[PDB]
Structures are given as C-alpha cells and as structure tokens.
Scaffold this active site. Structure first.
Site, mmCIF file in Angstrom:
data_model
loop_
_atom_site.group_PDB
_atom_site.id
_atom_site.type_symbol
_atom_site.label_atom_id
_atom_site.label_comp_id
_atom_site.label_asym_id
_atom_site.label_seq_id
_atom_site.Cartn_x
_atom_site.Cartn_y
_atom_site.Cartn_z
ATOM 1 N N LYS A 188 0.800 -1.215 0.000
ATOM 2 C CA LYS A 188 0.000 0.000 0.000
ATOM 3 C C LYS A 188 0.841 1.277 0.000
ATOM 4 O O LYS A 188 0.282 2.361 0.190
ATOM 5 C CB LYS A 188 -0.946 -0.011 1.202
HETATM 6 C C1 LIG Z 1 -10.140 -1.423 2.662
HETATM 7 C C2 LIG Z 1 -8.843 -1.314 3.487
HETATM 8 C C3 LIG Z 1 -7.884 -2.292 3.524
HETATM 9 C C4 LIG Z 1 -7.953 -3.644 2.748
HETATM 10 C C5 LIG Z 1 -7.833 -4.821 3.765
HETATM 11 C C6 LIG Z 1 -8.888 -5.694 4.091
HETATM 12 C C7 LIG Z 1 -10.307 -5.555 3.449
HETATM 13 C C8 LIG Z 1 -8.662 -6.734 5.027
HETATM 14 O O1 LIG Z 1 -9.685 -7.619 5.375
HETATM 15 C C9 LIG Z 1 -7.368 -6.898 5.643
HETATM 16 C C10 LIG Z 1 -7.158 -7.955 6.590
HETATM 17 C C11 LIG Z 1 -5.899 -8.118 7.191
HETATM 18 C C12 LIG Z 1 -4.849 -7.250 6.867
HETATM 19 C C13 LIG Z 1 -5.055 -6.219 5.943
HETATM 20 C C14 LIG Z 1 -6.348 -6.053 5.327
HETATM 21 C C15 LIG Z 1 -6.562 -5.001 4.382
HETATM 22 O O2 LIG Z 1 -5.506 -4.137 4.064
HETATM 23 C C16 LIG Z 1 -8.599 -0.018 4.327
HETATM 24 C C17 LIG Z 1 -8.992 -0.267 5.837
HETATM 25 C C18 LIG Z 1 -10.280 0.527 6.258
HETATM 26 C C19 LIG Z 1 -10.531 0.520 7.766
HETATM 27 C C20 LIG Z 1 -11.976 0.953 8.055
HETATM 28 C C21 LIG Z 1 -9.520 1.461 8.478
HETATM 29 C C22 LIG Z 1 -9.965 1.944 9.898
HETATM 30 C C23 LIG Z 1 -8.817 2.544 10.735
HETATM 31 C C24 LIG Z 1 -9.127 2.549 12.261
HETATM 32 C C25 LIG Z 1 -10.538 3.067 12.516
HETATM 33 C C26 LIG Z 1 -8.099 3.380 13.042
HETATM 34 C C27 LIG Z 1 -8.100 4.927 12.809
HETATM 35 C C28 LIG Z 1 -7.161 5.665 13.807
HETATM 36 C C29 LIG Z 1 -7.760 6.933 14.426
HETATM 37 C C30 LIG Z 1 -8.265 7.930 13.347
HETATM 38 C C31 LIG Z 1 -8.839 6.618 15.439
#
Ligand code: A1AVC
Ligand code: 6PL
Ligand code: 6PL
Ligand SMILES: *[C@@H]1O[C@H](CO)[C@@H](O[C@@H]2O[C@H](CO)[C@@H](O)[C@H](O)[C@H]2NC(C)=O)[C@H](O)[C@H]1NC(C)=O
Ligand SMILES: *[C@@H]1O[C@H](CO)[C@@H](O[C@@H]2O[C@H](CO)[C@@H](O)[C@H](O)[C@H]2NC(C)=O)[C@H](O)[C@H]1NC(C)=O
Ligand SMILES: *[C@@H]1O[C@H](CO)[C@@H](O[C@@H]2O[C@H](CO)[C@@H](O)[C@H](O)[C@H]2NC(C)=O)[C@H](O)[C@H]1NC(C)=O
Ligand code: NAG
Lengths: 693, 61
Positions: A188
């Site tokens: 990424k």
């Molecule tokens: C769609 C995204 C990543 C793809 C993905 C997916 C679908 C997985 O199944 C994974 C499983 C294991 C390892 C990697 C995976 C992966 O790469 C962005 C992620 C979106 C998500 C909602 C991010 C939220 C971040 C949190 C809320 C922390 C934020 C910190 C502060 C602002 C509070």
C-alpha cells in the site's frame, strides 16, 4: 536475565551453532492456544464450505454436457463429473470436521488439503487472498502437532493427551500473520493509495458517521480510511509481538476487523484474522483462564493439570536431536523465506504480468486497484469465405476476469476457436477490443485490436507484445476531469477516452441519444462521418455536434496519444421523464380538488389503479403504475424492523445449508447405487430446492 | 445470443453501470442486491475490487 532474551525470548548464543538453533526451535511449549486456534479455524471452514466454496451452486457450475470455458492454471487439469465433484466436497467437509474435533488429525488435514488445492487451481477466476491464506494455513497445520490439547484423539490415545509441542509450531503461524500484515502494508505504499483514489467511496458509510462529527468527509476519506489502513497494517505487524503493546494492538486490530467485516462482504476472512490475533498471546492462556472457574465448570472443560513430557522435543538436563527435530527448523526457515519471496516473484513469471503485477491472490494487495470497463468487442473472421462477424461480449463464460489478463484471454480465444464450428463457422481469427480504466483514469485499450489472439505468441516467462502499456503521463489529468464531472446536470453524462496513435475508434450513436457532442482535450484527431464520407480535423478546445442514429469514426493522427471526451444526454429519457412529471402533476391536481372537470378516460385506470373491464392501459400508464409500485415496495422494505431482517437472514442461510446437504445426498446415492427413474430424480430435485418455511 | 448484430456491437456510449443495475433490480435473484447497488457504489466498482466473496454468484442467486 538479559533484556534481549526477555523481549525476544532467546539469547544470541542459541544462534551460535546449528544444534543450538534446533534446540531453540524445538523447546517445550504449552499446547493450549494452538488447540483453540485449530478448533476455531476448523469450525469456520466447516461453515464456509457450503457458502463460498460453492457446494450449493455446484450443480449449475459443472453441469454435464454444457460447453463453458474453464480457466485452469494447467491445461492438463479437467473437471470430473458432478457426482465425483460432490464426493470431493464431501471429503473436504469430513476433513474439516475431523480437524475441528481433532479426530485422526493428520488424515483429516490431508483430506482437507488435497481437495482444497485441487479446487483452488481448477479455476483462476475464484482466486482471492483469503482463499490462498486458508490453503496455506491448512498446509501448515498438516505438520503441526495440534491434536495434543482438547482433542478426541487424546481420549482415544493417552500418550498424546495434554503434552508439550515444539516451539516452531507457534513460530510459523506468527510469521505467517506478520508477513500478511507487513506485505499488505508495504504494498500500500503506492501513489493510488496514499493519495486516496482507491476505495474513495467508503467514507460515506454510516459506520464512519461518528468520525464525521469532527472531520469533513474529504479528509475522512484520506486520513482515516487510507493512512489509518497503512499505519494499522504496520502496527498490527509489530505491536502484538512485544509485551507492552499487546493490549492496544489487540483492541485496534479487533475493532478494525469488525469494521471491515461489516463494511465489506469478504466472507470469513475477518473472523479468521480475529481468531489468529490471540495467537500472539502467551501459549498457556486457555489453561489459566479455565483455572479461574468454579469447580462445577471445570468438570467438563479440558484438563487443568500441567502438561506432560512429549517425545518430539529436546529437553535440557544433554539430549542428541533426532531427525524430525532438524527437519522442523529447516521447514520453518525455508517456508518463511518462500513466503517472503513469493509476492515479489513477478520478475520471473512475466507472462502473467499486466498493468498490475501478476495474478490476483498471492500478493496481499487487498483493495488497492479498482477498474471500470466501458466496452468489449469480439470480432471474428471466417477462414473459408472471409465474412466478418461479431460475438457477444461474455458468451460461454461464467466470470469477467478475462478482460484484464492476457493468459485468460488466450485460453478464451482457444475455447472459442474449438467451439465455434458447432455454429457453422470455419477456422476463425478472433480479435479483441476492450476499454478499461484503473483508479479513475482515461478509458484506454488494454489489448492490441489488430492481433489474432488464437495465433498470438504467449509463454509464462516471456513478456507479451500485444498488451498496451498503461499511460501514466495522463495521470495528473485526474484532477481536472473530476471538476468536469461536477459541472454537469442530472441528465448529461460524460465519457473520457484516451487513444493511441494510428488506431481508430468506430462508434454508433443510438437513436435515443440526441444532443451528443465530442470535444478534444489533448492532441489532434479527425472525426469522420461515414454517411457522407466527410471528416473534420479537430484541434484542442474544439467541439462537434455528432449525428444521432448513424456511425462515426475518430482517427488519431499525432505522434502521441490523444485524449477526448463524449458528452451526451438521453433525449428519450428526458422526454419520458417530462411526460411522467406532467401526468403526475395532473394526477396531483385532480387529487387536491383542482381540475373539477371530468377526468380523461385514460386517467381513469390511474386513479382506479387496476385495469379491469376496460381497454388495456397505454405504455405511459403502465410505466407510471410500475414506478409507483416499485416506490411502494422500496418504502416497505426500508421501514422493516431489524428482527424481521435477522429472521429472513437466518431462514435464507438455513435454506442454503439444507440445499447443499440434500444435493450431496442425492449425488452420493447416484454414485453408489446407480441412477433411479428419471421422474424420481425430477421429484427429488424439486424436493431439495423447496424453501423451508 | 451467441452472435451479436453489427449495429449493436459498436455502441461505446452504452451505460455499463446503469444497464447492470437495471438488469440486477429487474432480475428476481437481485432486487435486494440491485437496491443495495443503487444505494451503494456502482457494481462495476465492486467487480473492480476483486475481493468480493462471489458477488456475481450472490447476485445471481
Ligand atoms: C479497505 C482497506 C484495507 C484492505 C484490507 C482488508 C479488506 C482486510 O480484510 C485486511 C485484513 C488483514 C490485513 C489487511 C487487510 C486489508 O488491508 C482499508 C482499511 C479501512 C478501515 C476501516 C480502516 C480503519 C482505521 C481505524 C478506525 C483506526 C483509525 C485511527 C484513528 C483515526 C482513530
Ligand atoms: C551457521 C548458521 C547460523 C544461523 C543462520 C540463520 C539465522 C536465522 C535467524 C532467523 C530465525 C530466528 C528464529 C528465532 C525463533 C524464536 O525466537 O522464536 C520465537 C520468536 O517469535 C516469533 O515467532 C516471531 C515471528 C516473527 C514475527 C515478527 C517479529 C518482529 C520482531 C521485531 C524486532 C524485535 C520466540 O518467541 P516465544 O514464543 O518464545 O515468545 C517470546 C517473546 N514474547 C514474550 C514477547 C512473546
Ligand atoms: C475466545 C474467542 C476469541 C475470538 C474469536 C473471534 C472469531 C469467532 C468466530 C466464530 C463464528 C461466529 C459466527 C459467524 C457468523 C457469520 O459469519 O455469519 C455469516 C455466516 O454464518 C452464517 O450464516 C451461519 C448460519 C448458521 C445457521 C444456523 C441455523 C440454526 C437454525 C435454528 C432453528 C431456527 C428456527 C426458526 C423458525 C422458528 C456471514 O454472513 P455474510 O457472509 O452474508 O455477511 C454478513 C454481513 N454482510 C453481508 C453485511 C457482509
Ligand atoms: C478522413 O480522414 C482520415 C484521416 O486519416 C482518413 O483516413 C485514413 O484513411 C485512409 C483512406 O481511407 C486509409 O488508407 C488510412 O489507413 C487511414 N488511416 C489510419 C491511421 O487508419 C479518411 O480516409 C478520411 N475520409 C475519407 C472519406 O477520405
Ligand atoms: C446538449 O449539449 C449539452 C450537453 O451535451 C447541454 O447544453 C447545455 O446547455 C445549457 C443551456 O443553458 C447550458 O447552460 C449548459 O452549460 C450546457 N452544457 C454544456 C455546455 O456542457 C444540453 O444537454 C444539450 N443542449 C442542447 C441545446 O440541446
Ligand atoms: C436511453 O434512454 C432510454 C430511456 O428510456 C433507455 O431506455 C429504455 O431502454 C431499455 C434498454 O436498456 C429498454 O428495454 C426500454 O424499453 C426502454 N424504455 C422505453 C421504451 O420506455 C435507453 O437504454 C438509454 N440508452 C440508449 C442507448 O438508448
Ligand atoms: C447452419 O448453421 C446453423 C447454426 O446452428 C444451423 O442451422 C446448422 O448448424 C447449419 N445448417 C446447415 C444446413 O448447414
């Protein structure tokens, strides 16, 4: 006592010699956490076999006598008949249950492993990262001694009951999870993820509603979704291993996985990762957790006594290592090195390279590329008469991943070449013309539109000469194009095209789409109307009002690619909408008391709502009634209590499971005892498909 | 429908996402899936995601 040993669990002196390395990697460890992970993984795969592997849909996917184009990794592979496939899936289910209960563990692992990889390799269009992960986990657990705690095999054999396991069992799984998180994070580090383009529409979901209370949507789509994703990948990779950071890491990863599960429809991947997250805890957490229970609960849970010695471990007093002890360390090191190398092995297998890197499934590049196809044309030239014809875009196919990979296109071309003679076509030449854009760029050709794919040259380790390069020189235009998308009305629509020099695009504007215009953004093109054989040479910032209902062509005649845009409005749709609005206005005026005069005869069905004992309604009346009915149905659906939705969800899943089991039973009966009468088969098939109610 | 007409083949300006959404909503297998696609992003984006757990199969069923 050294801090290095305390943090990492080993001193440097253990790495001085091979024997000490083997002793370190084969030291005793409590077997409890591996047993818990075994149970959770087996249960999840048992639930997943009838849903995603396709046991319910197998009867309409490998139906005998149907001519469809498969995409196996090896052309030697061929599917077996449907009954034998159902038997294979039954073996998968039995292996998964055996792994869950730990009964004949090695046989269960083998019986789950071999069928799973056979099915995985049989169809390249069903490849995804989590399926590959499940396959790797099944391959790993075939060697691991996970039947030592909370296993029926222990009750059947006292020697393997509550005994020690070597350290590398935990090490391989921890390394696998770390590699998953770290490779996902590092992949990424691409311009399309740090800039917020990929998955840009995930910030409007209601789960992100609390974040919007403090941040705007545009920033919430970048800082939270993307940068949070990358930082969480690296943090989940590293924090869990160390002692101090385990709690915060567990909280963040658990919330992240729950949010991913609810946002997406990936399936069982999020739950499996949740199951894997505790594996970084101490190897004896379930035992001491059970110890904090009253006596009555302990009477049925697994044993609380300390583990007994095992025979597959090196115990210090000196014990000379055997052969399995060395092979365990060798397997651990080689497997971890292979896992590290495989995602970056795209410089060797260049036949599968494209705009993206290699096939999908084994790179951990999850949700980093989005594609939008605009058109797909298949032309064929008969090899005897010279006629030229056009095939449907997706005939004899069950997926749509052949539009992005050269090898799948070659296999599709060979399939078409062998199957076309059934429809009075001699030896054909097949040409493809596909338009696709990745991460909201100009639509451009992906394949050469002048190359016979059947006779084209392709090998796994040599780059193809008929895959057009991705033009990243037009990348910054993604700014301005978006602005053009925001200045249009509710009817106008815009399609951006970027074309190579020399190639030409032939298009037919439909009769409905009046008021269609073509504008040139960069380069120099010539637009030809074929009705009168008249072409105009267009410069930058010039617009032409094309005919509607005829053919035009656009030729690129510049040293460099040309970018232009089609802007159109569906005049028929606008007229229908205006007429419908007029009719609705008249209906409202009649309803609210205005228009006291008698209603028109055609308006009588509208107020009545049912055409009974009268002339059939006009198409406009039918459209109005259909729109009203659809609106009422949508309104009823939206105002639906949660308990009803949950009940429907449970009933649907029960139907899926019942259909899978009944079809498997029918297949097994047919395989063993032969085929009964055809009417009996029809009745049984009708019985199986019956909704539960 | 194996062979398509010369006139209908060369239609670049034919709505992919709108046509797919309409076909899904009209189809009995969709409707709920069609409604989700209309409320959600275009089905083309979902296909481009490539990680969906048999989105096409789910829509068909
Ligand atoms: C769609 C995204 C990543 C793809 C993905 C997916 C679908 C997985 O199944 C994974 C499983 C294991 C390892 C990697 C995976 C992966 O790469 C962005 C992620 C979106 C998500 C909602 C991010 C939220 C971040 C949190 C809320 C922390 C934020 C910190 C502060 C602002 C509070
Ligand atoms: C002559 C030849 C000489 C040798 C050449 C080859 C050298 C190979 C070196 C690489 C292999 C090293 C194997 C080490 C095995 C090992 O120590 O296993 C484990 C190591 O843990 C793992 O499984 C780690 C897997 C990788 C995960 C990412 C680690 C990140 C480390 C960051 C820097 C610190 C010991 O841990 P434990 O279960 O005893 O837990 C103790 C630690 N706490 C309490 C924090 C959980
Ligand atoms: C210690 C703990 C450590 C942490 C462990 C964490 C992980 C544990 C996982 C264990 C498994 C939990 C259950 C998982 C359920 C599950 O995944 O549900 C499903 C899959 O599971 C199921 O559907 C299970 C169905 C079970 C059916 C049982 C039927 C029982 C019938 C009983 C009689 C009813 C009588 C009714 C008439 C009166 C996933 O849903 P989906 O893929 O459609 O996604 C849903 C949401 N969307 C669509 C928005 C994406
Ligand atoms: C309209 O202008 C185009 C601009 O190229 C002319 O096209 C090329 O057309 C000639 C004659 O048909 C072909 O031999 C070339 O191969 C075409 N170029 C390319 C790159 O394919 C076109 O002929 C003009 N129209 C008329 C009626 O003369
Ligand atoms: C066809 O041309 C464009 C879309 O292809 C539209 O024309 C717009 O016309 C209104 C008239 O006031 C202007 O305010 C807009 O700025 C125009 N849009 C542009 C220039 O992009 C409209 O859909 C059609 N116009 C006609 C005359 O049929
Ligand atoms: C242009 O807009 C019209 C608005 O009606 C779209 O059409 C209907 O088109 C579908 C095909 O997708 C037909 O099955 C319907 O019968 C049409 N509606 C009628 C006659 O009321 C049309 O698809 C749009 N696109 C083009 C290229 O015309
Ligand atoms: C002509 O082609 C069609 C396509 O199926 C079919 O009628 C048959 O294969 C051919 N008929 C003859 C007489 O060759």
């Amino acid at each position: 006592d050294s801090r290095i040993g305390k943090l990492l669990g080993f001193e440097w002196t253990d790495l001085s010699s091979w024997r000490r390395l083997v002793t370190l990697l084969n030291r005793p460890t409590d077997p409890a956490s591996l047993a818990v992970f075994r149970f959770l993984f087996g249960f999840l795969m048992v639930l997943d076999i009838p849903q995603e592997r396709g046991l319910s849909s197998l009867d309409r996917k490998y139906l005998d006598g149907l001519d469809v184009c498969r995409f196996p990794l090896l052309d030697a592979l061929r599917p077996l008949p449907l009954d034998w496939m159902y038997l294979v899936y039954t073996i998968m289910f039995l292996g998964a249950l055996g792994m869950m209960l730990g009964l004949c563990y090695r046989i269960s692992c083998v019986l789950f492993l071999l069928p799973y990889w056979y099915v995985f390799l049989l169809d390249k269009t069903s490849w995804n990262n989590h399926s590959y992960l499940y396959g790797l986990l099944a391959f790993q657990l075939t060697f691991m001694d996970a039947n030592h705690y909370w296993s029926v095999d222990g009750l059947l054999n006292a020697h393997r009951r509550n005994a020690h396991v070597p350290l590398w069992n935990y090490a391989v799984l921890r390394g696998q999870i770390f590699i998953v998180y770290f490779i996902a994070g590092v992949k990424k580090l691409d311009a399309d993820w740090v800039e917020g383009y990929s998955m840009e529409y995930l910030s409007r979901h209601w789960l992100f509603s609390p974040f919007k209370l403090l941040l705007s949507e545009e920033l919430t789509s970048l800082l939270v979704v993307h940068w949070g994703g990358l930082l969480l990948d690296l943090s989940a990779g590293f924090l869990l291993f160390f002692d101090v950071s385990r709690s915060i890491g567990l909280f963040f990863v658990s919330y992240f996985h729950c949010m991913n599960s609810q946002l997406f429809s990936i399936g069982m991947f999020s739950y499996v990762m949740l199951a894997s997250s505790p594996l970084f805890c101490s190897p004896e957490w379930p035992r001491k957790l059970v110890s904090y229970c009253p006596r009555r609960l302990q009477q049925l849970l697994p044993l609380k006594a300390a583990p007994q010695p095992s025979v597959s471990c090196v115990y210090k007093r000196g014990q000379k290592p055997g052969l399995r002890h060395q092979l365990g360390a060798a397997f651990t090191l080689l497997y971890l090195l292979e896992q590290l190398f495989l995602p970056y092995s795209h410089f060797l297998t260049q036949g599968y390279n494209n705009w993206t890197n290699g096939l999908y499934g084994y790179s951990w590049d999850m949700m980093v590329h989005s594609r939008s196809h605009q058109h797909v044309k298949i032309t064929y030239r008969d090899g005897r008469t010279g006629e030229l014809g056009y095939l449907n875009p997706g005939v004899f196919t069950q997926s749509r991943r052949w539009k992005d990979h050269a090898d799948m296109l070659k296999q599709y071309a060979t399939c078409l070449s062998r199957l076309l003679p059934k429809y009075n076509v001699t030896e054909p030449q097949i040409y493809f013309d596909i338009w696709v854009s990745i991460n909201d760029r100009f639509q451009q050709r992906i394949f050469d539109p002048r190359v016979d794919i059947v006779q084209a040259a392709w090998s796994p380790f040599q780059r193809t000469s008929w895959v057009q390069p991705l033009l990243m020189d037009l990348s910054p235009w993604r700014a301005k194009l978006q602005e053009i998308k925001s200045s249009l009305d509710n009817h106008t629509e815009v399609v951006f095209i970027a074309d190579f020099p020399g190639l030409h695009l032939e298009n037919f504007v439909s009769e409905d789409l009046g008021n269609t215009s073509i504008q040139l953004l960069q380069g120099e093109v010539t637009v030809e109307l074929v009705a009168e054989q008249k072409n105009q040479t267009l410069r930058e910032g010039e617009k032409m009002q094309l005919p509607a209902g005829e053919y035009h062509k656009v030729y690129t005649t510049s040293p460099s690619p040309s970018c232009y845009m089609y802007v159109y409005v569906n005049t028929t749709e606008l007229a229908l909408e205006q007429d419908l609005a007029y009719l609705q206005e008249l209906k409202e005026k009649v309803e609210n008391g205005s228009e006291t005069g008698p209603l028109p005869p055609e308006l009588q069905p509208l107020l009545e709502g049912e055409v009974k004992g009268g002339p059939e309604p006009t198409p406009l009346v039918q459209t109005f009634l259909r729109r009203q009915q659809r609106l009422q149905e949508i309104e009823r659906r939206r105002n639906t209590p949660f308990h009803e939705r949950f009940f429907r969800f449970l009933l649907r899943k029960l139907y899926v499971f019942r259909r899978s089991f009944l079809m498997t039973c029918i297949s097994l009966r047919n395989l063993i005892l032969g085929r009964p009468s055809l009417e009996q088969l029809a009745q049984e098939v009708t019985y199986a498909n019956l909704r539960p109610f | 429908t194996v062979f398509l007409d010369h006139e209908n083949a060369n239609k670049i300006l034919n709505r992919p996402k709108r046509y797919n959404s309409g076909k899904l909503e009209e189809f009995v297998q969709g409707n709920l899936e069609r409604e989700c696609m209309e409320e959600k992003c275009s089905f083309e984006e979902a296909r481009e995601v490539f990680e969906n757990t048999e989105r096409t199969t789910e829509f068909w069923k």
